[PDB]
Ligand binder design. Structure first.
Ligand SMILES: CC(=O)N[C@@H]1[C@@H](O)[C@H](O[C@@H]2O[C@H](CO)[C@@H](O[C@@H]3O[C@H](CO)[C@@H](O[C@@H]4O[C@H](CO)[C@@H](O[C@@H]5O[C@H](CO)[C@@H](O[C@@H]6O[C@H](CO)[C@@H](O)[C@H](O)[C@H]6NC(C)=O)[C@H](O)[C@H]5NC(C)=O)[C@H](O)[C@H]4NC(C)=O)[C@H](O)[C@H]3NC(C)=O)[C@H](O)[C@H]2NC(C)=O)[C@@H](CO)O[C@H]1O
Ligand SMILES: CC(=O)N[C@@H]1[C@@H](O)[C@H](O[C@@H]2O[C@H](CO)[C@@H](O[C@@H]3O[C@H](CO)[C@@H](O[C@@H]4O[C@H](CO)[C@@H](O[C@@H]5O[C@H](CO)[C@@H](O[C@@H]6O[C@H](CO)[C@@H](O)[C@H](O)[C@H]6NC(C)=O)[C@H](O)[C@H]5NC(C)=O)[C@H](O)[C@H]4NC(C)=O)[C@H](O)[C@H]3NC(C)=O)[C@H](O)[C@H]2NC(C)=O)[C@@H](CO)O[C@H]1O
Ligand SMILES: CC(=O)N[C@@H]1[C@@H](O)[C@H](O[C@@H]2O[C@H](CO)[C@@H](O[C@@H]3O[C@H](CO)[C@@H](O[C@@H]4O[C@H](CO)[C@@H](O[C@@H]5O[C@H](CO)[C@@H](O[C@@H]6O[C@H](CO)[C@@H](O)[C@H](O)[C@H]6NC(C)=O)[C@H](O)[C@H]5NC(C)=O)[C@H](O)[C@H]4NC(C)=O)[C@H](O)[C@H]3NC(C)=O)[C@H](O)[C@H]2NC(C)=O)[C@@H](CO)O[C@H]1O
Ligand SMILES: CC(=O)N[C@@H]1[C@@H](O)[C@H](O[C@@H]2O[C@H](CO)[C@@H](O[C@@H]3O[C@H](CO)[C@@H](O[C@@H]4O[C@H](CO)[C@@H](O[C@@H]5O[C@H](CO)[C@@H](O[C@@H]6O[C@H](CO)[C@@H](O)[C@H](O)[C@H]6NC(C)=O)[C@H](O)[C@H]5NC(C)=O)[C@H](O)[C@H]4NC(C)=O)[C@H](O)[C@H]3NC(C)=O)[C@H](O)[C@H]2NC(C)=O)[C@@H](CO)O[C@H]1O
Lengths: 335, 335, 331, 332
């Protein structure tokens, strides 16, 4: 059977095809984020008018379904078709990970605890340098945007793709969007902790990496972070909503990152997101949510989704545990 | 015959107790404002430490319930007891009105279209003057805060209790909170219009009032508005969140105004809010929302609630329609 | 023949060259916007690190001058030069015009008074359409950003190059930066008002629009075939060509060929009342060239007034002259 | 016996009165903060039309003078009466101190480095507790507004009278205004370290001391000041003082309302000092308005409002010098 150690349900049948057109999905009650789904869609209308035009009828259809009852048994009653996904094992288990938008403090000039530079997009040959070399000073100081008080925060923000920069002087939070990356492949840092016997395999998470950095010295932290030759460059947007690859403001848990080749942007997705406590342990229950694919990821390929948790600490704690599975139905309207 | 033109529903029977302990509420699905409610709780937590301290048990219970997918049936596992309100008709149906926070365009000094003063709290004897007298100049110019471009906007804001003031110069919107009122009783203008013979009986709305003001001249608008001797004074909070009587930042459609004697502040309320189109016509469907009583009103007494729609024009259009009914349950703890 | 209405000077003599190095400028005394200038300096540091690197010396040179005091007679003790610019009449009268960042209210969807679209950058062939054609609907609705309540406001913002958009719903003001323009040359509106004779400034044109009907206003505005496209920066500071946040009356638009960006300029800006009449007195200010303009060529500057109505009233009247010195480091 | 190390002078002559009508001010230069001064008048015109309504006569005179060049040699041509103040030494030099509005980062709930509570106005009997007792938990947790990451920052903000609170979550900076104080007299930590023999006082030097020593050592030192200030959140409102008028950086000062009432225009020779707070020897001409008060600001003494932020704090902590000042009024 499918060990539910990471949330693997099997109460639907046996659907192997990519888009398994089921009559109506397995679920009790209405989705938890109905009104929240409306906001997400509204953003698609103003931020991507061409993407909205292609999915107008789809969005308008599910809205009435939510305003009437919301039960996954009253979908076809409005011409909505649920196309279940095969997932990993092809039995019905789609991978679910998570990411958020962290807020970090920094200064325009280095001072005191602020000695860690955040770089912008450099020239063609400047993007060749690895993370370790950049730490040593491979890039010119004119490409620095700010200096943070934590090398770990910069690394986490690097992994997330973006983040708000708080200068702590009164000015609004500047959104440092994903502008580009260096010519080096991304390599797992948490794995390096397991390679030398520093962190447990079963107890691998966001809090473990952060706790490790506080337990060890700066030299030991820098050495570990350098094991990831990849480095991300940002572009200041100045208090703009969190936007992904689709250039549409992402809403907390109402949007996900996907493989554009399989699941294109603007795709409505209803899924059973597995719940977990503060310790990230799978309790056994799920959560019905309506989300839209509006972002991409280097590690997000095939039957895999990256649920956008939100902005802030609480959104980060919730995002670090997500490496579970669950079912998902691609919602399409009848022609 | 049982009226259903407004938005009444008779199927849960007649309730004798002001609060009938019904296990599972007659909900259509799940809370569509999980994020709005959670936000509202966090606002009470940081703005009203003692009010939150007492209702914290309920707040943590309903949030954990919302986490479980917001299952209106499984909420009993969390010990959440639903006490359905008897309603104004004792059939579970309760009156639902609405108010919002209008954004008024103004200037510090009178110029061009900006010739309508917004006053602050004057001395004891200055608060005796009626609206008509204040329009003629009963108050000193040193009590003026700003000059708007519409007498109708000032009147609507007066009725709402507060509103944001946009100076259109780059500076943030200043929140003019309810500071006080004059020594004259309030008299509805909607009644005056019907009785005057201009506006029709059933064809009354806050929209028709705004349209009427644009159809008629300044002298005709002023004369009509003077039929309401009451006048509200404001106090600029300088870009502060919209706060009500409880001094807690109000969240759009996640908070309501109530009679503190019957429904005290901090009370969690799950309700079936009747939906209505752009023309304010009751289509027939409802909406499940979790709201908290955090404000009061002069016309809000007994079995009656004033749903805080939000900030802006869209929030105003949605607010100036509500004179309908719907079911509501007062969420509490064990008996 | 020999006017002094626009603040023209003669008390300096003819200038035989564009820039003349003096010793103690003919200015009044101490600058008023010493603080605003400092705010402009760090803005260049944060925004354009390359520009701040080449002019770091100049910014710090004048930084010590104002720190102590700010007397125009004594500047050499801080290592500063004073290259006095000439003018049209060659008497040091540098032309000073003005522009600001207007705040226009609008919604995402057309409703009521909001029926005037604000467009973004369309494709290559979509940029060929003239203003009159775009008004009639030459561009697709998917290129619309917002709908304003005034066609005149959209036109003024079009002329200014940018503007803040207030959606009146609580959300922050979205800065619609200059993204591009259409394939048509700019035509003057006052020009058309002279043809049939009806009227002069940005204040006189605004009054004309209020006096005449919508059909008469649209017809006049269509006389300018040029149309500007914007790009929402989502609540970002007002930036010009140099991509540096502009500070009110502490920055100006110039001809990059003559006066390159990052150049410090101390000038005697001619004052004027609410009616735009030159009273006779000047104002000493320190400003930096951080923007450009299509009509800003040669010995001419466009003083950035600021954001809002008051900044617009002040900018619409500005078409006067004044002296200006290019502050550089002593060799 | 005439000191000059702290900015004091003698080229003005000894005074016989607090204020004296001077036909021509003994100071060369021009108001280098004319823009900041004009900004203050607009703030007094919007935030307090009552005080402005009776102080306009002086502003209109100092504005007409400013617009018409701004040369101190023509002030009488606009109706501006200069009044030389004696200060500490009857030679025209007044004691100039400074304060600013610190931006502190804090959270609504205690977590990690954020373990230092910022309290609001408690009941009558709750205001009796001293700082040391409050640190130990004399006040209930329901009176806490936020938890900062530095006990020193809280102390400095306490001395300043107010400060902006940055929650680092996106929300605007909340201005914690001076709501009240406890029933204990203020004791400067400066006098403590001066007597202890650990000074090279400098209110910023103590900041370095706090970072050098541990939490227990910092708390112990701070407990020497029994006074404790309570704040009131205004949520992104301009820095306002006692006059309830938004203060402008170095264009406003705190004064003794009995001697120098609020709304009073003051032109002064503010003594300049380097990064190390050493008096170089030069001054600075500034136009300022009295719009705030202070417990230690009595008689011939002013507290120059430096501004908001770190740089404003470094500049403020050094001020303990002297300089000449003229009370600008109208000519009868
Ligand atoms: C040891 C170990 O392995 N532990 C595991 C741990 O790693 C796991 O944690 C999670 O890991 C995953 C994978 O490592 C992390 O995944 C992140 O996912 C996010 C979102 O999916 C990624 O961020 C997005 O990245 C894409 C690029 O791939 C961005 O897309 C780009 O967007 C820009 C605009 O910003 C586009 O540029 C614009 O282009 C237009 C058109 O050409 C042009 O006009 C504009 O000018 C231009 N704008 C600019 C500024 O240039 C660009 O075209 C587009 N690129 C593409 C290809 O479309 C997107 O914007 C990013 N989204 C946001 C938001 O910023 C992120 O890259 C990815 N990281 C990695 C390393 O892959 C995940 O973050 C992480 N989560 C957490 C909490 O740590 C955990 C799981 O919990 O498991 C452990 O076992
Ligand atoms: C025929 C029919 O059915 N017609 C329908 C029509 O009625 C509907 O339209 C709606 O009508 C209703 C009724 O006319 C309108 O109701 C409005 O509701 C709002 C919110 O409930 C009211 O605004 C609140 O008013 C209360 C006072 O009553 C305010 O509370 C005060 O708050 C201040 C602080 O702001 C407190 O002062 C502070 O006190 C503390 C402690 O003492 C002190 O320390 C502070 O210093 C001090 N602060 C200051 C600044 O002084 C004060 O104590 C407290 N007062 C009390 C008693 O507690 C509260 O703040 C207001 N809320 C907000 C937000 O501002 C409003 O007054 C009320 N209007 C009227 C006329 O009663 C409703 O607005 C309207 N809606 C619309 C859209 O028009 C329509 C709707 O569709 O349907 C028709 O069918
Ligand atoms: C009858 C009569 O004549 N009456 C008089 C009346 O006309 C007078 O009114 C005044 O009129 C004048 C002239 O009509 C108005 O002048 C305006 O002046 C402003 C400021 O100088 C101009 O706005 C600037 O325009 C330039 C382009 O010309 C903009 O520069 C561009 O900036 C963008 C970024 O925003 C750059 O793009 C970026 O490029 C980088 C690098 O390649 C790339 O990486 C980025 O991605 C890219 N970003 C984007 C978004 O694309 C671009 O490269 C650059 N262009 C160049 C060439 O460098 C600049 O940003 C604008 N500034 C601002 C701020 O937006 C404006 O164009 C100009 N209007 C006209 C029609 O020429 C003046 O405004 C007006 N004043 C008033 C008050 O009405 C009155 C005087 O009051 O007197 C009557 O008598
Ligand atoms: C060894 C040694 O001596 N070393 C030196 C060292 O000491 C020096 O450091 C400096 O020390 C001095 C003195 O200790 C510090 O001076 C500070 O100065 C500031 C400004 O002058 C003071 O802050 C103001 O305090 C007043 C009260 O005194 C506040 O005024 C109150 O404002 C509130 C509103 O906020 C009013 O309440 C309102 O009232 C109305 C009407 O009744 C009501 O309607 C409202 O509801 C109500 N609002 C509320 C919220 O309740 C209230 O009425 C009014 N009070 C009065 C009496 O009018 C004012 O708001 C504060 N200003 C700001 C801004 O907040 C501060 O108290 C004072 N500190 C002390 C300890 O006295 C100075 O800060 C310090 N500087 C530094 C850098 O440390 C250094 C200097 O370099 O030199 C060493 O040598």
């Amino acid at each position: 059977s499918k060990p539910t150690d990471r949330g693997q349900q099997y109460k639907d049948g046996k659907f192997t095809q990519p888009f398994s057109l089921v009559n109506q999905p397995d679920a009790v009650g209405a989705p938890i984020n109905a009104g929240d789904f409306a906001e997400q869609i509204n953003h698609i209308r103003n931020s991507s008018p061409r993407l909205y035009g292609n999915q107008s009828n789809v969005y308008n259809a599910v809205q009435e379904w939510l305003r009437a009852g919301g039960d996954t048994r009253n979908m076809r009653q409005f011409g909505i078709d649920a196309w279940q996904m095969e997932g990993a094992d092809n039995y019905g288990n789609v991978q679910f990970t998570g990411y958020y938008t962290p807020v970090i403090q920094a200064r325009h000039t280095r001072q005191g605890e602020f000695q860690y530079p955040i770089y912008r997009m450099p020239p063609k040959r400047g993007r060749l340098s690895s993370r370790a070399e950049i730490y040593a000073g491979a890039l010119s100081d004119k490409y620095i945007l700010a200096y943070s008080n934590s090398l770990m925060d910069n690394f986490i923000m690097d992994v997330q793709g973006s983040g708000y920069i708080d200068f702590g002087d009164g000015s609004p939070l500047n959104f440092f969007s994903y502008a580009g990356k260096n010519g080096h492949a991304y390599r797992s840092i948490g794995k390096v902790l397991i390679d030398r016997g520093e962190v447990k395999k079963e107890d691998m998470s966001m809090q473990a990496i952060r706790h490790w950095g506080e337990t060890h010295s700066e030299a030991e932290v820098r050495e570990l972070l350098e094991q990831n030759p990849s480095f991300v460059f940002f572009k200041p947007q100045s208090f703009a909503p969190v936007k992904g690859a689709s250039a549409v403001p992402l809403v907390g848990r109402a949007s996900v990152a996907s493989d554009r080749s399989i699941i294109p942007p603007g795709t409505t997705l209803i899924a059973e997101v597995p719940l977990l406590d503060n310790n990230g342990k799978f309790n056994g229950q799920y959560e019905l949510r309506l989300m839209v694919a509006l972002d991409v990821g280097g590690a997000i390929k095939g039957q895999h989704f990256a649920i956008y948790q939100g902005i802030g600490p609480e959104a980060g704690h919730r995002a670090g545990w997500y490496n579970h599975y669950g079912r998902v139905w691609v919602l399409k309207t009848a022609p």
